[PDB]
């Protein structure tokens, strides 16, 4: 029984597939309708092939014959070749996101704010013109009727604004704030020593988790908000019917 | 013994030559392994930055939406003024509503001012106390606060959610009762 | 960059401006905030 074991060992260490003992199958993904192709080749036992297809992880996968080490090396070769492609595409995505963010964070924000202020200014001008129109043309001395109500409202709000107390409260508040300003700044300068305790005390790990929990909350909150929004928009419909 | 002693040499040499390939596999693993492990961390990162942009753009939508309806009413209010002058060169009862409208609008803005003022009072009154304790006193203790906050927000959200669901279902009830 | 945008938005939020209504809101936090949450 000696020259049999030897031949069997010589057979084991070989790509000829006489019980190669390095028989493992790897599933290569292939989209339909290419499944009908592949289609093994020289020394494939339909037993192994079907048994591979039997315990299939997901559809559109075809098994691949990995006999020994050069094959697994090759599989690695491919894996790197795809690694680089993955990283590249990912970087593309990254770059386009940077572009979008650069646009928004600078080019668009400024134009939004600027446009809003321009609107306010033009609103003022619009009311000014819309006011002078009601002056020069309507200077026929016959200005009355609904004017009384207008000047009544105007007088009410104007009287409400032009009050000593209401106007005084702000002035009192400001100084009332400056008191705390000075007091706080003094008490702060006094206790302006605990810096390392503060910086190191704050810098931690729970902060990262808290950020995550915050994002989750934000998502939940957004969802709820939009849900209510829809609940409103969907109700004002029923309000008509 | 020649053929045998030579055959064993060739065989053992071939096997050893195969084990060299096995080793070649073993060598090219850890690097590639790191490279592989790197991927999910980046895609799990880039997916986050995308969410940032989306939350940013989506926030940018409402900005224009506001700016859209603003210029449109300013377009009309600036248009209602010229048609009055163009009518003159060759609506007085209409602008009254506009002025009284601006008045009615501002009438609440003043109330907002009052509200915010009262809040500011109520707030600074607290600032006083905070400083009044901070002067009196003169890391790990506050970490508990954060948790105590978040675990409470969970509850508050879960509280609100019920209200929301109740409303929504309450609306669908009427919606149903309509075509039912 | 999400939380960053949340900060940035909540940063630009409490900082003006001339928008005919929306003035910057004062931030609280921690002690006052918990009670302010409970008073919901």
């Amino acid at each position: 029984p000696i020259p049999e074991q030897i031949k069997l060992i010589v057979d084991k260490w070989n790509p000829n597939h006489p019980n190669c003992a390095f028989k493992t199958y790897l599933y290569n993904k292939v989209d339909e309708h290419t499944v009908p192709l592949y289609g093994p080749g020289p020394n494939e036992d339909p037993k192994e092939w079907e048994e591979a297809l039997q315990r299939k992880p997901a559809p559109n996968f075809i098994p691949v014959l990995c006999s020994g080490f050069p094959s697994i090396v090759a599989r690695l070769m491919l894996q790197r070749r795809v690694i680089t492609e993955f990283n590249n595409k990912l970087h593309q995505i990254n770059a386009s996101l940077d572009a979008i963010l650069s646009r928004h964070d600078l080019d668009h924000t400024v134009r939004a704010f600027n446009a809003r202020r321009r609107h306010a200014e033009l609103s003022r001008r619009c009311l000014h013109l819309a006011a002078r129109v009601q002056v020069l043309r309507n200077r026929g001395y016959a200005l009355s009727g609904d004017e009384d109500e207008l000047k009544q409202k105007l007088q009410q709000i104007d009287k409400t604004l032009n009050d000593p107390a209401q106007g005084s409260r702000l002035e009192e508040l400001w100084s009332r704030l400056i008191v705390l300003r000075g007091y706080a700044e003094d008490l702060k300068d006094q206790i302006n020593q605990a810096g390392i305790t503060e910086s190191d005390g704050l810098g931690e790990e729970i902060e990262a988790k808290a950020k995550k929990i915050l994002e989750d909350y934000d998502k939940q909150l957004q969802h709820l908000k939009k849900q209510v929004e829809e609940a409103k928009k969907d109700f004002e419909e029923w309000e008509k019917q | 013994s020649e053929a045998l002693q030579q055959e064993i040499a060739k065989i053992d040499e071939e096997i050893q030559k195969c084990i060299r390939d096995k080793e070649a596999v073993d060598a090219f693993l850890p690097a590639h392994g790191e490279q592989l492990a790197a991927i999910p961390t980046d895609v799990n990162f880039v997916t986050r930055k995308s969410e940032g942009a989306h939350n940013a753009l989506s926030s940018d939508i409402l900005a224009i939406d506001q700016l859209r309806e603003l210029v449109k009413q300013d377009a009309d209010n600036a248009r209602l003024s010229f048609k009055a002058i163009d009518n003159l060169k060759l609506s007085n009862a209409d602008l009254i509503s506009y002025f009284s409208k601006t008045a009615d609008e501002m009438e609440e803005m003043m109330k907002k001012f009052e509200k915010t003022i009262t809040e500011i009072e109520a707030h600074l009154t607290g600032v006083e106390a905070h400083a009044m304790a901070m002067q009196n006193v003169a890391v790990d203790e506050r970490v508990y606060e954060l948790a105590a906050v978040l675990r409470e927000f969970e509850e508050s959200i879960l509280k609100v959610a019920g209200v929301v669901g109740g409303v929504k279902e309450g609306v669908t009830e009427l919606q149903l009762r309509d075509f039912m | 960059a999400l939380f960053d945008s949340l900060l940035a938005r909540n940063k630009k939020q409490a900082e003006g401006e001339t928008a005919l209504g929306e003035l910057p809101s004062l931030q609280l936090g921690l002690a006052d905030l918990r009670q302010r949450l409970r008073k919901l």
Partner: antibody, heavy 123, light 105 residues
Framework: EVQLVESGGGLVQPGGSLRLSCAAS????????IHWVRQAPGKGLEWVAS????????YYADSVKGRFTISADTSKNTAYLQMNSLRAEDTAVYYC????????????????WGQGTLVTVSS | MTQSPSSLSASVGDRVTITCRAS??????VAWYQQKPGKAPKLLIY???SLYSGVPSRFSGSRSGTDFTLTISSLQPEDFATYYC?????????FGQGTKVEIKR
């Protein structure tokens, strides 16, 4: 759709002062960290200084500590290298660059360089 | 101590391999760069071994202990330029002496 425009270089007397400007286009400067790297004529590359705004960190090479001062305007979205107490040995072509997608971990590599500006210090 | 690179040379299509030895063996953070005369530096390899986007496959970076290596399996008429490595120790980015390759004849 990404570039680094470099300016502010040129001629200057010894012991003088300059402010190099690296205007970045295609990405927020705050999100990334920007680096300066000069190259002396006929010599190799020399790292000068780094700035990352979102962290608020600044780092300088031994050969320019205290003398130089890097910064960056987030609103203008531009980096600046303030050079003081210059010497004849500071004569070099100054380049500006950035790191990989954010940091991201500890993957320090300069992907996008500019075309650089030549700073000549001579009497 | 700004230094100039060691100018080596070889014929076209020769298998070239360049090596830098970091005083502090690093985890990753070792970039390799190419630079042609008059033109700024460009990135080749990053994270020691990860090839960068927009780089031919003939460039292949690797590591062996404390020594990092840039391999060009086939030198091309466009591969004639100066090559630098980069150490990074958080921080103080250090550039190697560099290495210029020239066509042999």
């Amino acid at each position: 759709e990404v570039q680094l425009v470099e300016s502010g270089g040129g001629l200057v007397q010894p012991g003088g002062s300059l402010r190099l400007s690296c205007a970045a286009s295609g990405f927020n400067v705050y999100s990334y960290s920007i680096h300066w790297v000069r190259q002396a004529p006929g010599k190799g590359l020399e790292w000068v200084a780094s700035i990352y705004s979102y962290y608020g960190s600044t780092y300088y090479a031994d050969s320019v500590k205290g003398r130089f001062t890097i910064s960056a305007d987030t609103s203008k979205n531009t980096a600046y290298l303030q050079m003081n107490s210059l010497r004849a040995e500071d004569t070099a072509v100054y380049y500006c660059a950035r790191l990989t997608w954010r940091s991201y971990r500890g993957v320090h590599a300069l992907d996008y360089w500019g075309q650089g500006t030549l700073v000549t210090v001579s009497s | 101590m700004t230094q100039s690179p060691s100018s080596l040379s070889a014929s076209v299509g020769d298998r070239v391999t360049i090596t830098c030895r970091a005083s502090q063996s690093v985890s990753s953070a070792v970039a390799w760069y190419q630079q042609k005369p008059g033109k700024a530096p460009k990135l080749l390899i990053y994270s020691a071994s990860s090839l960068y986007s927009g780089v031919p496959s003939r460039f292949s970076g690797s590591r062996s202990g404390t020594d990092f290596t840039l391999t060009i399996s086939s030198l091309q008429p466009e591969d004639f330029a100066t090559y630098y490595c980069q150490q990074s120790s958080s921080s103080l980015i250090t550039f190697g002496q560099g290495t210029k390759v020239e066509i042999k004849r």
